[PDB]
Ligand binder design. Structure first.
Ligand SMILES: NS(=O)(=O)c1c(F)c(F)c2c(c1F)N(Cc1ccccc1)CCS2(=O)=O
Ligand SMILES: [Zn+2]
Length: 257
């Protein structure tokens, strides 16, 4: 009876195994755009992905992960609200069963069809496992997806999904350029939060871009053909793998714009 996204084991249950679920800096949150404070001291976000080395794509039973070589400063995030430098380790998405839901963060209560999370760890802590034990260990760049025109830079991801249909499948995934997943603008909101998945550790500086990307109905439908189950088990479609908005508590969301 492990955690997941169902009636039986979903977000409302997670606190029993992970009591930090009811903590002071949980994610995601609703971004109230009128209440977010413009902070003129925030810097532009520096996204340096030209040397990124993707390795592999994995169905981990909850979503799919595109993993990168993070054994040197290749692909890094810095600037914005961050001190020092954060290395890209992986990205993944959360998405819905319907185009009207799927994102984890919301904007004035609006849900997007999906949300991309690019996960980075603070190189001062040496490895990802040490970083997640620190309040400033991770920086996650979140990007909303709306359904409209296709995102050409997503199609390589879309096209490999049939090879990792079920939990625990993995495929070589080299030479993928994550720059093709970014919107035009790097304007952002930021706040201190958590992993949105168990173990829900309060280690993340969230940076959520204002501008969504557009993906086609066909691209998101292929996400929804993935399976949460392993091969040889009954099919349960990988949809609605998002945590809802959590209480903001004693936090301020800052805007770079
Ligand atoms: N959502 S998030 O950005 O806070 C988040 C995160 F910051 C992580 F560091 C990691 C997450 C992760 F979600 N996952 C990926 C996942 C997606 C969906 C269901 C389970 C796991 C597992 C691997 S991880 O790299 O440790
Ligand atoms: Zn995520």
């Amino acid at each position: 009876h492990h955690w997941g996204y169902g009636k039986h084991n979903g977000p409302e249950h997670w606190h029993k195994d992970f009591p930090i679920a009811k903590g002071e800096r949980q994610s995601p949150v609703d971004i109230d755009t009128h209440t977010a404070k413009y902070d003129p001291s925030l810097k532009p976000l520096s996204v340096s992905y030209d040397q990124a080395t993707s390795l592999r794509i994995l169905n981990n039973g909850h979503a799919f992960n595109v993993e990168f070589d993070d054994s040197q400063d290749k692909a890094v995030l810095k600037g914005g609200p961050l001190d020092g430098t954060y290395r890209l380790i992986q990205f993944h998405f959360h998405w819905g069963s319907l185009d009207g839901q799927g994102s984890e963060h919301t904007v004035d209560k609006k849900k997007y069809a999906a949300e991309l999370h690019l996960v980075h760890w603070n190189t001062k802590y040496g490895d990802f496992g040490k970083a997640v034990q620190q309040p400033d260990g991770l920086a996650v760049l979140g990007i909303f997806l709306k359904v409209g025109s296709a995102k050409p830079g997503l199609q390589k991801v879309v096209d490999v999904l049939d090879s990792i249909k079920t939990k625990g499948k993995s495929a070589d995934f080299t030479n993928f350029d994550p720059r093709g997943l970014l919107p035009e603008s790097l304007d952002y909101w930021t706040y201190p939060g958590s992993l949105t998945t168990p173990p829900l550790l309060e280690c993340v500086t969230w940076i959520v871009l204002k501008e969504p990307i557009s993906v086609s109905s066909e691209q998101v439908l292929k996400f929804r053909k993935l399976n949460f189950n392993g091969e040889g088990e009954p099919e349960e479609l990988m949809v609605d793998n998002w945590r809802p908005a959590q209480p903001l508590k004693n936090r301020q969301i800052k805007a770079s714009f």
